[PDB]
Symmetry: C3
Subunit: 218 residues, 3 copies
């Protein structure tokens, strides 16, 4: 939301976008590790959801790295969003139900709204309604995160949707928190378009994720 | 035996239909498996550690239903009550892929598998087993590649055809390394999202580690 | 020197054949490389650690034959006696440089530093790729340096169905402490038609070896 159709002639990545259009898949993923020692302890002490702690860190970080908010819309236009929200499949008794959760820089506002959304899903709600709304609208002004807190991994890969259009928005996976040499760490993976996002931008994003996880634990 | 699935009654009908439209609906996960006890036990027994974790892997695939769904060569969803395991066995100076039958009885599995990997035909196509499987078109196997001298934290897999990224689960096992007094090895698996979610892989990995411990 | 391979006499005939039908026969591996001594030595010399492991990587590629097989622009399998290394160098407010391998580390370091210092200000970020594409031999390997990003996995692009990439791609990440040592993640993307796990094992071993050697 708060979208800008990019002036590609003035855009610093015009050459990158043109180069990567010719590829069957220009998307790629990186799995890293995030230190969560302090946040794991703090979320437990506060009787709060650790999932929402790192979900806040992830969506805030995406809203502080410009390159993570570029999309190719359903008409092929390069668009930049001043704001992106986060969608996540929430485990449901028996399946998953995907919720769209708004970003607020104020952690207390974010946490309450998100907890209400993941606790109070409508009983008559389509578990895949959020994705269908996003696809029909065609802006893709979100990032998507799947939580797998029981699976430790050092790598995960993602699907290839269409040749020339490998994905529609950044995808992420967060895995099990594990101990190593006195720290608690969890694996975090992200899938992005090379046309929009380089390693330097991912470095900034991962740094902010770890930084804000620490910040909300004090 | 083999079962042609009644897709109208199948709980994954919507998942299967959704992932048919993808160029590649297959994905891989690399994790690590604790093998401290099994490595020590295999050495004490003068036995093949490779066959220890090969057993653990194929048993686990035979205890997670979702790992035995295939799309056959006619496009049908089929479910196998049991799948065997194929593996490229190194031949000094290439490799030869052997099909090894699964038995829950570990001593039977170990004996039959050791016999198969010791008596391989010398004038063998490194991919002949794959060609036999392709002609039959049922894909009642899983595939594991052993690289005991290569430590890795990630490996990716090939994309065969658009709309059909692979024909059966593929796996890779790497070097056992020390981690805070324990021994772990990396294990990677490639599966179809149409058939296998993260919960199923979690069950699979847990069973691999469990059965490695049990046979020790 | 470039050599057009006689596929009928080639020991990997069965492999190039098994993999031509694939949409993508390329795959990547991420491993860990011990860099304790070389990182210390580069710091003591007030020198670029980047060029230390760039030397180790390009030397190792020039000592593993399988990493120098390419499909040229005309579809021919070709083998290069030597390959250079191309790398995107970050530029104030990037430029891909081609750096030749020289066995003398001091010579390599001086030439690479000079090559990176005399980069054109008006240089096309993809000029190296365009020269390479027009020539069509692909006698290079490509390495991307991300020294501030720790990773355990990275994946790579798929260029064309049936031609997933034109030369090996690599990524080197942030050095971290593990079990008392300093290690950094190193990833490589290669064609299964040309490169198996054993070749990657030899390559990774040589990378670690030459990092130690040039630290003296």
């Amino acid at each position: 939301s708060m979208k800008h159709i990019i002036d590609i002639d003035a855009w610093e990545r015009r050459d990158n976008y043109g180069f990567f259009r010719s590829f069957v898949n220009s998307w790629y993923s990186v799995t890293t590790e995030i230190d969560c020692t302090e946040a794991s302890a703090a979320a437990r002490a506060a009787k709060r959801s650790f999932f929402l702690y790192y979900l806040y860190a992830v969506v805030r970080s995406a809203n502080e790295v410009d390159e993570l908010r570029y999309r190719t819309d359903k008409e092929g236009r390069v668009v930049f969003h001043d704001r992106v929200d986060i969608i996540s499949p929430i485990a449901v008794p028996g399946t998953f139900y995907t919720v769209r959760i708004p970003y607020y820089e104020d952690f207390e506002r974010f946490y309450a709204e998100a907890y209400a959304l993941i606790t109070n899903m409508p009983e008559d709600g389509d578990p895949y309604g959020a994705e269908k709304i996003l696809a029909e609208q065609g802006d893709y002004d979100v990032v998507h995160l799947s939580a797998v807190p029981k699976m430790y991994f050092t790598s995960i890969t993602y699907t290839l949707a269409e040749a020339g259009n490998g994905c529609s928005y950044p995808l992420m996976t967060a895995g099990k928190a594990v101990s190593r040499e006195g720290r608690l760490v969890f694996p975090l993976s992200i899938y992005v378009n090379h046309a929009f996002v380089d390693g330097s931008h991912l470095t900034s994003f991962f740094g902010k994720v770890e930084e804000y996880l620490k910040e909300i634990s004090h």
